[PDB]
DNA sequence: TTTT
């Protein structure tokens, strides 16, 4: 049973360096080429380079030469990759994957990936603002979670009682800070008759806010 | 250098239908030893890429016989005889020799009937205005196809600066898409104007779908 | 045979 255990999520600052690991198990680590793949958020897969643990031979994508550095501690059966001069374009999920020898001659085993986030922003708690209809047997309500860092936040409606008709839109970076929104659609005999509350939790700032949606 | 072109970029099909994705190298990728090292990978969201086909037409162990690959020299193809729900994700062709290079990927999604968006506009919250901010939010829910354009108008004049959009992935139940468009201004700027308009242009409508409000 |  071949496994490639990668290191955890990393939060880094611009210009810094990040050294990530990939522990290989279940096979002769030295006998196979270890490949590294990059995937910027929402983009495709890019090949960075490879290393042959046995003799430490490395090959790089011209683009990542003098940017990424592949090494290995054959003793620890672990491969490492260090990305220096970190910029916003270095934020991505990086995978390590083994290239099989006989039979398949392909990348048969992959790691789970290491998400790296390069930002100079400091932990900032979110501003949760209730979105009520303008002053139709259905009413659409919303909740705006603006200006936080880092991901993630968890947004629920009525503590999770309201699961149907909800659309939580993925967060977006608006100048180093994230913004997220969510909409819930209920019948007109539910609101404002009954109470509808938006719950937001931002772990990194130990924040837990509840926002009741009140009519205008 | 070898360029790998994948077509189509997006591929909507009903479950049960056949699927065929194409991959083209800018030049022959045949190795000197005579073997073509072309592979196909499937990446389900939030998951690592998994090996499907190796050496142009060979199926990796455990891959369903629905999957078959072919092609020669410059043009390669992955055919799926009957699309299952478990086949949805992004497909990448990979060139495993010389300089390993991935293709841009083809996203396999579900085809459904057209659906016009339900637009909802929301004025800035009192809590947000109290802090000198003014975010006008517009939700465009449950539409299909995913192609849509949103134009913001202030007092009739179009506004491009300050807009932030976000799209959800294809709805897991009804296969529709939703998006959020937020227009951020300052309380001052917001108060210097009266009418706010969010209009959408979608194929399910000859005229634009509009939602406006007068802050007075 | 792959990592030329
Ligand atoms: Ni070229």
Q: Report CB contact under 8 Å: A170, B122.
A: no
Domain boundary at B96, B112, B128, which?
B112
Q: Which of B60, B85, B112 is the last residue of a domain?
A: B112
Out of A110, A130, A169, closest to residue B125 by CB? A130
DSSP string, B141-172: EEEBSS--EEEEEETTEEE-TTEEEEEPPPPT
Taking the Cβ of residue A173 and every Cβ of chain B, the question of whether any pair is shorter than 8 Å is answered with no
Q: What CATH number did the domain enclosing B46 receive?
A: 2.60.40.10
- Residues B2, B106, single domain; the answer is yes
Domain count, chain A: 2
Last residue of a domain, one of B82, B112, B142: B112
Same domain, A72 and A100: yes
Q: What DSSP string describes chain A?
A: --EEEEPPPEEE-TT--EEEEEEEESS-GGGS-EEEEEE-TTS--EEEEEEETTTTEEEE-GGGBTTEEEEEETTTTEEEEEE-S--GGG-EEEEEEE---TTT-S--EE---EEEEE-----B--EEEEE------EEEEEEEEEEEBSS--EEEEGGGT--TTEEEEEEEESSSSEEEEEEEEEETTTTTTS--EEEEEEGGGTEEEEEE----
Which chain B residues are within 8 Å of A186, Cβ to Cβ?
Answer: none
Residue among A61, A111, A181 minimizing CB distance to B182: A181
List the domain range (segments joined by +) for residue A163. 121-214
Could you give the C-alpha distances from B77 to B21, B22, B93, in angstroms and in order?
6, 5, 9
B4 with B28, same domain? yes
Cβ–Cβ < 8 Å for B140, B150: yes
> Which residues lie across from B151 on neighbouring strands?
B199
Are residue B3 and residue B108 in the same domain, yes or no? yes
Q: How many angstroms is it from A48 CA to the middle of ligand 1?
A: 17
- In 3-state terms, what secondary structure has residue B79? strand
Shared domain for B118 and B106, answered yes or no, is no
Pair (B101, B146) in one structural domain:
no
Q: Are A60 and A154 in the same domain?
A: no
Q: What is the DSSP letter of B182?
A: E
Q: Which of A120, A144, A160 is the last residue of a domain?
A: A120
Q: Which domain holds residue B170?
A: 114-213
Asked if A51 and A133 sit in the same domain, the reply is: no
Based on the domain organization, do B100 and B145 belong to the same domain?
A: no
Same domain flag for B202 and B133? yes
Is the same domain home to B104 and B150?
no
At which of A120, A147, A180 does a domain end? A120
Instruction: Report the number of distinct structural domains present in chain B.
Output: 2
Q: Give the DSSP letter string of B90-132.
A: EEEEEE-SSS-EE---EEEEE----B--EEEEEPPPHHHHTTT
Same domain, B102 and B139: no
Do A105 and A134 reside in the same domain of the chain?
Answer: no
Residue A106: give its domain's CATH number. 2.60.40.10
Of B27, B106, B36, B48, nearest to A106 (Cα)?
B36
- The 8-class DSSP code of residue B36 comes to B
Q: Is residue B10 domain-shared with residue B105, that is, in the same domain?
A: yes
Give the method of determination: X-ray
> Are A157 and A108 contained in the same domain?
no
Same domain, A107 and A158: no
**Cβ pair B41, B140 in contact under 8 A:** no
Question: Same structural domain for residues A199 and A97?
Answer: no
Note whether A105 and A144 are same-domain residues: no
**For residue A116, which of A161, A74, A151 has the smallest C-alpha distance?**
A151
Nearest to A74 by CA among A7, A28, A108: A28
Asked whether residue A33, judged by its CB, lies under 7 Å from any atom of the DNA or RNA strand C, the reply is yes
Measure CB to CB from residue A106 to each of B54, B99, B133 and give the nearest one: B54
Q: Are residues A146 and A109 in the same domain?
A: no
Q: Do A133 and A90 share a structural domain?
A: no
Do A164 and A104 have their domain in common?
no
> B-contacting residues of A 54-113, CB under 8 Å?
61, 95, 97, 99, 104-108, 110-113
| A32 and A136 both lie in a single domain | no
Resolution (angstroms) equals 2.4
Q: How many residues does chain B have?
A: 216
Are residues B28 and B5 part of one domain? yes
Is the same domain home to B27 and B104?
yes
């Amino acid at each position: 049973e071949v496994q490639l255990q990668q290191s955890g999520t990393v939060l880094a600052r611009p210009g810094a360096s990040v050294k990530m690991s990939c522990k290989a198990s279940g096979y002769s680590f030295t006998s196979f080429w270890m490949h590294w793949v990059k995937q910027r958020p929402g983009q495709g897969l890019e090949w960075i380079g490879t290393i042959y643990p046995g003799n430490s031979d490395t090959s790089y994508n011209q683009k990542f030469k003098g940017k990424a550095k592949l090494t290995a501690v054959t003793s620890a059966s672990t491969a490492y990759m260090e990305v220096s001069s970190l910029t916003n374009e270095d934020s991505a999920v990086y995978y390590c994957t083994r290239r099989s020898g006989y039979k398949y001659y392909a990348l048969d085993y992959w790691g789970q990936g290491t998400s790296v986030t390069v930002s100079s922003a400091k932990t900032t708690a979110p501003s949760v603002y209730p979105l009520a209809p303008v002053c139709g047997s259905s009413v659409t309500l919303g909740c705006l979670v603006k200006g936080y860092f880092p991901e993630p936040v968890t947004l629920t409606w009525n503590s999770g009682s309201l699961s149907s008709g909800v659309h939580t839109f993925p967060a977006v970076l608006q100048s180093d800070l994230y913004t997220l929104s969510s909409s819930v659609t209920v019948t007109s005999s539910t609101w404002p008759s009954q109470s509808i509350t938006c719950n937001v939790a931002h772990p990194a700032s130990s924040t837990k806010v509840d926002k009741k949606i009140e009519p205008r | 250098d070898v360029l790998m072109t994948q077509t189509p970029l997006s591929l909507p099909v009903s479950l049960g239908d056949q699927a065929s994705i194409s991959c083209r190298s800018s030049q022959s990728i045949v190795h000197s030893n005579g073997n073509t090292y072309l592979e196909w990978y499937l990446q389900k969201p939030g998951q690592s890429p998994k090996l499907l086909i190796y050496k142009v037409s060979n199926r990796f162990s455990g891959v369903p016989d629905r999957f078959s690959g072919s092609g020669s020299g410059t043009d390669f193809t992955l055919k799926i005889s009957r699309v299952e729900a478990e086949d949805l994700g992004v497909y990448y062709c990979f060139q495993g020799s010389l300089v390993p290079t991935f293709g841009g990927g083809t996203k396999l999604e579900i085809k459904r009937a057209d659906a016009a968006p339900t637009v909802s506009i929301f004025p800035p919250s009192s809590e947000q205005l109290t802090s000198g901010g003014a975010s006008v939010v517009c939700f465009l829910n449950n539409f299909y196809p995913k192609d849509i354009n949103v134009k913001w108008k202030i007092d009739g004049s179009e506004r491009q600066n300050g807009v932030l959009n976000s799209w959800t992935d294809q709805d897991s139940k009804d296969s529709t898409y939703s998006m959020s468009s937020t227009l951020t201004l300052t309380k001052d700027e917001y108060e210097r104007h009266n009418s706010y308009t969010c209009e959408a242009t979608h194929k399910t409508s000859t005229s634009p779908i509009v939602k406006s409000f007068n802050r007075n």
